Design a protein around this ligand. Structure first.
Ligand SMILES: [Cl-]
Ligand SMILES: [Cl-]
Lengths: 204, 196
């Protein structure tokens, strides 16, 4: 009990984390809650923004968690890959082309991939008839029955399997995926609050 | 059947996430022959793109040279775990991205009421992220009423935000050129959104 408290107390100081949008909304809060419980003496600083923003501000952070590609001159730990699903009301299989497509703001390489897939699979020109700034707005539009969309798996929690059909997105019989990486200077692992965070996040 | 054609709507972020979807669902059901086009972005972005839309719905101020119908005012609440009422100053404040006048008002309130310098120890790009951080017990925040649905009254305490005994409010307006009301799909939308 003395040594348990000793270790808990021991890990302290500050950790600054930069995290991309989707994971920041869905998984980070849970991780941070667990991290505060296990390591109450460390002060957290967090930014959640687009991958591009976080990568631009890399000097602000001990650790970055981003969707896209590895960051050069840093260690990169692969956390997971995400598949993507075309989602539409189950009751409406046939006339999917007539429903508005809901587009959320994201990396332009990603959007152009989605557009391509739409062209080739609905055999009709892609048009974002509903365009939104925030992913949760996209999800709310979907859930309320207003349209169809494509979401990565991480955003698909609490979407009724009873109400909606899910079609895995593939381009030239290759699943559209995005990888998420945790990136840091390896020497930052000598800080115990950072080492602790990195192993906790990687264990999810 | 009669009411048809296209309507293009621009809407600010919070209402776009929270109320617009419901309105659009009702509007599709009542007027199935009209094709909707929608953009949800920040107030500034929607106002900048005003020529793209028949109707704008935004939080902030009226738009000049357009008709403006006041939809509702929002109060704002400081929200923290009941579980930690005492040491609120120690918890991280969660800031969502918003216009700088609003943030400066939040900062000022924090200074004068927690008697400690405001610092956004958790800053997030999207309001739903702020709400998720709050709900998971990570910190404290200030939300406008419209974003407060499904926050447990059992788990959290709510303190109305006031500056010099004046409630911090934001108004939401629907704005359009009055001549757009001659389009029945637009007239229909405007009266639905205003009644909701
Ligand atoms: Cl992400
Ligand atoms: Cl708003």
């Amino acid at each position: 009990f003395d040594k348990m408290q000793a270790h808990i107390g021991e890990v302290n100081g500050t950790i600054s984390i930069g995290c991309s949008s989707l994971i920041g909304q869905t998984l980070l809060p849970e991780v941070l809650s667990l991290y505060n419980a296990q390591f109450p003496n460390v002060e957290i600083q967090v930014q959640v923004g687009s991958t591009e923003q976080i990568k631009a501000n890399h000097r602000d952070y001990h650790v970055m968690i981003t969707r896209g590609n590895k960051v050069m001159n840093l260690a990169n730990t692969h956390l997971f890959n995400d598949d993507h699903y075309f989602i539409f009301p189950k009751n409406r299989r046939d006339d999917v082309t007539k429903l508005p497509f809901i587009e959320f703001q994201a990396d332009p390489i990603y959007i152009n991939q989605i557009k391509q897939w739409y062209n080739d699979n609905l055999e009709q020109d892609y048009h974002a008839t509903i365009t939104v700034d925030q992913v949760a707005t996209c999800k709310e539009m979907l859930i309320s029955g207003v349209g169809v969309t494509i979401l990565p798996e991480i955003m698909m929690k609490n979407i009724s399997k009873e109400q909606f059909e899910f079609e895995k997105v593939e381009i030239d019989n290759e699943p559209l995926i995005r990888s998420t990486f945790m990136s840091y200077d390896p020497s930052m692992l000598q800080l115990p609050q950072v080492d602790s965070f990195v192993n906790l996040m990687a264990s999810f």
